[PDB]
Nucleic acid binder design. Structure first.
Lengths: 188, 82, 209, 276, 101, 97, 101
DNA sequence: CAGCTCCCTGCTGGCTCCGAGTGGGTTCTGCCGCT
DNA sequence: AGCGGCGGAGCCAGCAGGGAGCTG
C-alpha cells in the first residue's frame, strides 16, 4: 500500500482556497501508537496581506506561527526570526515575514500564547491554567513527534518549525519549486 | 371528428404497420376468420401480411390528436408504406 | 471627457428611437437615422455643464394608428434614480393625458423605485432601461431573430388553428432583453421569424410569462 | 495561441449543465471598418478592451519620509521646478508597457484624482526624462492608511480596458466562416480576411457598446451571458452553434434534427433549462 | 428572388445542404431508364416543366390546411426544398443539360 | 477510484526501473494498481542511531550547540526527516557516507 | 539525461520506428504517452454514459404527435414541425444549391 | 436632521450526483457471562 | 439452556453587512 512519505516537508499550492501556499509535514515517531499527526504551515492568498498561519492537530482554528513560537517559549522576536530566516541580509524574506509579525504584537510572553492556543483547542479549558496545560500537552506530544517528545525538546521543535516556515517562504518567493505529489520519492 | 375533417397523414406509418400486423396475425393465430383466400401458407404473420397487401384487414385505427380528439382511419382507406 | 459622453448619448438616443420605431410609435426617418453631427449641432457637444444636458433632451412619440397613446422617455441626471426623482416623472405622467413612458437610468435604479414601478404599473405601464444596455440595438445582432408581436385576434386565430391552449406554446420570460425591448405584458405571444438551415424559414411562437 | 478552448466532453458538460462559470469564456469580437482593415487601429481597439491595472505598468514602488516637499530627498529637478504631508509615495513605471498601452502621466493622474478625489495630489515627471516617476502625498492611521491605499490602487484601478477580460488575442482568421463574407457587384462572395480579436474573459455588453466594435457579429461563447444580454432566442442559436462546434470539430456529422430538438427542449420554457 | 432568399439564409455561402430526395440523382436515373441520349433535341416543352413543377409544389404538402396561417407554415416548411427543386428543374437546365423527354 | 483526476493515475517519470511501465489493469484501476520492477527492492528499515553516532563525531554540530549566526553558510542534515544538525563541509562527508 | 536538456531525445521524441525498436528511454516515454490514452479511455466512460443518461431523461417523452407537431409528455409544443421541417432524419441526403453563388 | 427600518447583495455551508453489463472467488452473519 | 443485555464539483438556504427611506 502506497502512502505519502512521513517526517518530510511538502510545500503545495492548492488552486481555489483562502490561502495560496501550504506546507505540510505528516509526522510519525519510530512506529509509535499515535497516528500520522499532520501539521500544515500555510500562507494566505490576499491592507497588510500575506499572513502566515499554521493549522495544528487537535486545534479547531489556524494559529499564526509567531504565536506558536511564543507559546513554544521564545519571548523575543529576533530569536524567533533566527529560526526562520537564516541570513538577516536578505530583506525580501523580511518583507514577507513582517506581515505575520505585526499580526501578533499583542502576545509578548509564553503563557498568553498558551492561553490563545488553548482557547482554539478542541477541548477548551474553563480556566486559564487548564488551557495552559492542554496547549502545553499539544505542543509537547501532538506537534512534530518525530523530532522528539521529551522534557526539553522546545529548541529542536522550534528549529524544525522555523525550517518549515522557511521552506514555505522559499516556495512563496520562488527561490525553490513546489514539491510533486506523484514523485515516488515522496511515497512509501 | 367527422369524415370531412381529417387532418392526419393518409400514409400508414411504420408503427401502425407494425402494430396492425401484430394484432391481426394474433387474431389469425386465435382462429379468426381470414379475409383473404390463402394458398396453403400456415404462418399467421404471413397471412396478416397478405391481408395487409390485399387491403382486407377488418381493423380501423384511432389516431388520438394532442388536443384530445381522435380520427378513425380504416386500414383499407389509408396508404400502406411498403 | 465630453466627446465620449456625447457619442454615448447620441447612440442612446438612436437606439431609443429605433426601439420606438420597432414598438410601433411614429418616428420620422430624419430622427430615425441621424449622424453624430446632427446630434452635435442640435444638442451641443458639452454634456458636462453645457447645453446638451438631460431633461429637455427627452423624446415624446405617438403611435401610428392613433395619436392618443403617447410614450415619453426620460434620462435622469442622477446615476441611481430614486422615488423622489421618479415621482416627478409620475406627476408629469398624471398632468399629461399620457399612459406610459420609459426611464433610461445612468446607474442601477433603487429597489424602492423598482417596487414603485411595480405598484403603479396597472395605472401607468412604465418600465426602465440602463445607460449601458441601450448603446446597441440587440435586434440588429445576428443571433437575435425577427421578433413580431401578435395582436389578440391573430393570437386567437393561431390557437384555433393549432387546437392548443394558451399555456402549451413555447414561452418567454418578460425580463429577457428582447421582450423588454419591445415592451409587452404576460399573456402576449410573439412571432419569431428565424432562418432554418434545414427548410428555409421557420416560424415559432413564444408566450410571455 | 489560445487553443485552451476546452473542446470535447468538458465543453459538452459545460453546455448541457449550463454552468455560470465555464472554464474558457471567450469573445470573438469583430471590427467595423478601417480598424478591421489595418493592424494599428486594431491594436488601438485591443488596448481599450484588455484590462490593465497599474501593477502592469509599474516597475517598483517605494515610500519615503520627506520632511519638506521642497527638500526633495530624492534628487529630482523636476520636482524642484514644479514646486500638505511629509509621508509621501513614489512609484516607478517602465517605458515598455507605458508605450505599449499608450497612456500618459496626465491620464494616470486624472484617473487617481477621479477615483480618490482631492484627498491626495499626484506629482508626475514629464515624458522627457528616462525615468518615469509620479509622487503621491495626502492633503490635509497615518502611514498604514497610505500603505493600504497603495495596495488598493495597485490591485484594481482599471487604467485602460474593461474588467473581467484579462487577455485579448489578435489574429487574421483562416477559416471562411470566421472571415468576413460580402457580396460583390457581380454576386460573388469574396471571402475577406479582416482583423478579428478573441478574449479570455466575457462581458458581451461593455464590449459591443464600444466605438469601432461590430455589434452584429460578436458572439461570446458564454450561454448564461448571452441569456443575460441578447435573450432566449439568441441563446438557442448560440447554443446550437456551440453544440455543433464540438461535434463538427472531430469532423463527424450529426443531423440538425437532434441539435435543434435539444436546443429547443432546453429553451422551450423561456429560461435556460440546464439538463440536470 | 429565391436566390436572394438563399443568400440571406446562408451567409458564408455554402451550397452543401441536407434535403429529402436527391433530385440530381433521380434525374440521372430517369436519363438511364428512358434512354435520353442527350445528343438530340428534346421533345419536352419548356412550359410543361414550369407547370409541372408548380403542381408538384402543391403536391408536396407538410402543413395541411387552407387558411393563411397554414399556407404560410407550409410555404416556410417547404421553402428550401422548393427553392432547390425550382433551381434544378429549370426550363433552361432541362433544355440544355438533362434533355429529359 | 472512479475519480476524474487523472494525475495520480499517470505514469510518473520516477517510475523508471522500480515500477513496470507496461503492467497495469485496464479497468477503473489504471495506474492505481501497479506491479513491481524486477530488480526493484523495497527497503525494510533499520535504526538510524548508528548513523547518528557516526555523524556526531566528524565536524558537525547539534542544534543546541550552535547559534543561528553560522547556520546560513553551512548545510542542514536530515536523518529520517528530522533535522539532526549542521555541517560546514558537505563535500568529503558525502564521500565519507 | 543531463539537467535542463530540452533536446528531442530528452523530452519524448522517438527518432526510431517500430522496426528498429525503441531505445530504453524512448520505450519508457512511449509507455508513459500511451498510459495517458489508456487512462483517458477508462475515465471518459463514467462521464459520457452519465451525459447520455441525463440527456435521455430530459427528452425521453418528446415525440411527434399525429398533429405532426413535436410535443413533450405534457403536450407542451417544442417544435411545430419535427426538425422545423416535419421530415424524417433517415431519408435525407446531402445536396448542392446550384442557384447559390 | 439624526436615528431607525427594510430590502438587496454578497458570501459560506450543505446536499446530491458520479457508464452499461458479465464471469468468478472470498468471508460474514457476537461474544461474555451470569443468573 | 434460552434469552436478556451490551474525494471532488456544482446548485440552494442562511446570515451578515450595507445603503434608501420613512418618521418624530
Amino acid at each position: 500500500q502506497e502512502k505519502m512519505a512521513t517526517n518530510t516537508v511538502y510545500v503545495f499550492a492548492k488552486k481555489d482556497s483562502k490561502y495560496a501556499y501550504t506546507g505540510e509535514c505528516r509526522s510519525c515517531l519510530e512506529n509509535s501508537s499515535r497516528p500520522t499527526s499532520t501539521i500544515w504551515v500555510s500562507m494566505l492568498a490576499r491592507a497588510i496581506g500575506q499572513r502566515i498561519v499554521a493549522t495544528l492537530p487537535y486545534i479547531k482554528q489556524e494559529v499564526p506561527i509567531i504565536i506558536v513560537f511564543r507559546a513554544l517559549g521564545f519571548v523575543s522576536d529576533r530569536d524567533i526570526l533566527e529560526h526562520i530566516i537564516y541570513d538577516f541580509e536578505d530583506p525580501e524574506m523580511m518583507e514577507m515575514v513582517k506581515p505575520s509579525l505585526d499580526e501578533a504584537f499583542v502576545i509578548q510572553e509564553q503563557n498568553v500564547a498558551l492561553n490563545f492556543i488553548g482557547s482554539r483547542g478542541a477541548k477548551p479549558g474553563v480556566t486559564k491554567e487548564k488551557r495552559i496545560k492542554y496547549a502545553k500537552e499539544v505542543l509537547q506530544k501532538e506537534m512534530l513527534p518525530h523530532v522528539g517528545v521529551s522534557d526539553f525538546c522546545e529548541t529542536k521543535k522550534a528549529y524544525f518549525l522555523g525550517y518549515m516556515v522557511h521552506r514555505l517562504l522559499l516556495a512563496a518567493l520562488g527561490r525553490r519549486e513546489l514539491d510533486d505529489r506523484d514523485h515516488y520519492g515522496n511515497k512509501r | 371528428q367527422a369524415n370531412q375533417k381529417r387532418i392526419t397523414t393518409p400514409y400508414m406509418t411504420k408503427y401502425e404497420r407494425a402494430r396492425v400486423l401484430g394484432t391481426r396475425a394474433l387474431q389469425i393465430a386465435m382462429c379468426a376468420p381470414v379475409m383473404v383466400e390463402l394458398e396453403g401458407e400456415t404462418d399467421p404473420l404471413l397471412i396478416a401480411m397478405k391481408e395487409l397487401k390485399a387491403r382486407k384487414i377488418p381493423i380501423i385505427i384511432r389516431r388520438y390528436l394532442p388536443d384530445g380528439s381522435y380520427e378513425d382511419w380504416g386500414v383499407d382507406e389509408l396508404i400502406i408504406s411498403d | 471627457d465630453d466627446e465620449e459622453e456625447t457619442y454615448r448619448l447620441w447612440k442612446i438616443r438612436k437606439t431609443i428611437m429605433q426601439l420606438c420605431h420597432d414598438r410601433g410609435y411614429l418616428v420620422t426617418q430624419d430622427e430615425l437615422d441621424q449622424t453624430l453631427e446632427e446630434f452635435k449641432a442640435q444638442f451641443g457637444d458639452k454634456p458636462s455643464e453645457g447645453r446638451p444636458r438631460r431633461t429637455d433632451l427627452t423624446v415624446l412619440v405617438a403611435h401610428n394608428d392613433d395619436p392618443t397613446d403617447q410614450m415619453f422617455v426620460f434620462f435622469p441626471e442622477e446615476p441611481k434614480v430614486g422615488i423622489k426623482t421618479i415621482k416627478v416623472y409620475c406627476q408629469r405622467m398624471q398632468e399629461e393625458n399620457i399612459t406610459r413612458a420609459l426611464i433610461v437610468v445612468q446607474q442601477g435604479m433603487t429597489p424602492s423605485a423598482k417596487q414603485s414601478l411595480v405598484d403603479m404599473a396597472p395605472k401607468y405601464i412604465l418600465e426602465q432601461f440602463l445607460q449601458q444596455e441601450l448603446l446597441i440595438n440587440i435586434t440588429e445582432h445576428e443571433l437575435v431573430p425577427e421578433h413580431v408581436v401578435m395582436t389578440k385576434e391573430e393570437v386567437t386565430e393561431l390557437l384555433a388553428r393549432y387546437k392548443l391552449r394558451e399555456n402549451q406554446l413555447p414561452r418567454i420570460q418578460a425580463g429577457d432583453p428582447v421582450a423588454r425591448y419591445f415592451g409587452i405584458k404576460r399573456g402576449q405571444v410573439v412571432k419569431i421569424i428565424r432562418p432554418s438551415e434545414t427548410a428555409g424559414r421557420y416560424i415559432t411562437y413564444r408566450l410571455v410569462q | 495561441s489560445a487553443k485552451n478552448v476546452t473542446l470535447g466532453v468538458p465543453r459538452l458538460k459545460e453546455l448541457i449543465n449550463i454552468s455560470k462559470k465555464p472554464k474558457t469564456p471567450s469573445l470573438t469580437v469583430f471590427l467595423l471598418g478601417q480598424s478591421a482593415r489595418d493592424a494599428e487601429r486594431a491594436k488601438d481597439i485591443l488596448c481599450r478592451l484588455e484590462h490593465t491595472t497599474l501593477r502592469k505598468v509599474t516597475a517598483n514602488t517605494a515610500i519615503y519620509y520627506d520632511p519638506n516637499p521642497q527638500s526633495t530627498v530624492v534628487a529630482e529637478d523636476q520636482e524642484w521646478v514644479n514646486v500638505i504631508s511629509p509621508w509621501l509615495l513614489r512609484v516607478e513605471l517602465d517605458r515598455k508597457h507605458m508605450t505599449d498601452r499608450k497612456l500618459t502621466m496626465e491620464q494616470i493622474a486624472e484617473k487617481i484624482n477621479a477615483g480618490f478625489g482631492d484627498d491626495l495630489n499626484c506629482i508626475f515627471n514629464d515624458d522627457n526624462a528616462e525615468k518615469l516617476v509620479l509622487r503621491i502625498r495626502i492633503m490635509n492611521d497615518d502611514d498604514v492608511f497610505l500603505r493600504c491605499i497603495e495596495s488598493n490602487m495597485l490591485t484594481d484601478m482599471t487604467l485602460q480596458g474593461i474588467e473581467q477580460i484579462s487577455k485579448v488575442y489578435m489574429h487574421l482568421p483562416q477559416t471562411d466562416n470566421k472571415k468576413k463574407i460580402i457580396i460583390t457587384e457581380d454576386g460573388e462572395f469574396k471571402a475577406l480576411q479582416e482583423w478579428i480579436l478573441e478574449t479570455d474573459g466575457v462581458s458581451l455588453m461593455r464590449v459591443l457598446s464600444e466605438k469601432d466594435v461590430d455589434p452584429v457579429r460578436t458572439t461570446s461563447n458564454d450561454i448564461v451571458e448571452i441569456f443575460t444580454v441578447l435573450g432566449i432566442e439568441a441563446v438557442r442559436k448560440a447554443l446550437e452553434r456551440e453544440l455543433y462546434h464540438v461535434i463538427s470539430f472531430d469532423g463527424s456529422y450529426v443531423n440538425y434534427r437532434h441539435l435543434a430538438l435539444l436546443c429547443d427542449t432546453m429553451t422551450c420554457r423561456g429560461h435556460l433549462m440546464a439538463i440536470t | 428572388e429565391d436566390r436572394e432568399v438563399l443568400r440571406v439564409i446562408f451567409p458564408t455561402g455554402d451550397s452543401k445542404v441536407v434535403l429529402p430526395c436527391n433530385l440530381l440523382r433521380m434525374i440521372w436515373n430517369a436519363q438511364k431508364i428512358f434512354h435520353i441520349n442527350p445528343r438530340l433535341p428534346s421533345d419536352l416543352h419548356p412550359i410543361k416543366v414550369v407547370e409541372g413543377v408548380k403542381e408538384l409544389s402543391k403536391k408536396l404538402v407538410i402543413v395541411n390546411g387552407d387558411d393563411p396561417l397554414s399556407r404560410q407554415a407550409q410555404e416556410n416548411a417547404t421553402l428550401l426544398f422548393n427553392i432547390h427543386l425550382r433551381s434544378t428543374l429549370c426550363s433552361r437546365r432541362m433544355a440544355e443539360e438533362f434533355r429529359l423527354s | 477510484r472512479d475519480g476524474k483526476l487523472a494525475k495520480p493515475r499517470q505514469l510518473h517519470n520516477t517510475l523508471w526501473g522500480m515500477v513496470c511501465p507496461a503492467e497495469t489493469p485496464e479497468g477503473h484501476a489504471v495506474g492505481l494498481v501497479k506491479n513491481l520492477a524486477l530488480m526493484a527492492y523495497i527497503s525494510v528499515g533499520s535504526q538510524p542511531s548508528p548513523i547518528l553516532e557516526f555523524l556526531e563525531e566528524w565536524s558537525m554540530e547539534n542544534l543546541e550547540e550552535i547559534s543561528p549566526a553560522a547556520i546560513a553558510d553551512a548545510t542542514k542534515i536530515f536523518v529520517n526527516g528530522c533535522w539532526v544538525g549542521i555541517h560546514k563541509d558537505p563535500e568529503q562527508l558525502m564521500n565519507t557516507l | 539525461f543531463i539537467k535542463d536538456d530540452y533536446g528531442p531525445e530528452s523530452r519524448g521524441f522517438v527518432e526510431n520506428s517500430y522496426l528498429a525498436g525503441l531505445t530504453p528511454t524512448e520505450f519508457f516515454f512511449h509507455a508513459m504517452g500511451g498510459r495517458e490514452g489508456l487512462i483517458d479511455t477508462a475515465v471518459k466512460t463514467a462521464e459520457t454514459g452519465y451525459i447520455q443518461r441525463r440527456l435521455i431523461k430530459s427528452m425521453e417523452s418528446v415525440m411527434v404527435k399525429y398533429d405532426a407537431t413535436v410535443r413533450n409528455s405534457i403536450n407542451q409544443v417544442v417544435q411545430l414541425r419535427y426538425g422545423e421541417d416535419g421530415l424524417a432524419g433517415e431519408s435525407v441526403e446531402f445536396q448542392n444549391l446550384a442557384t447559390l453563388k
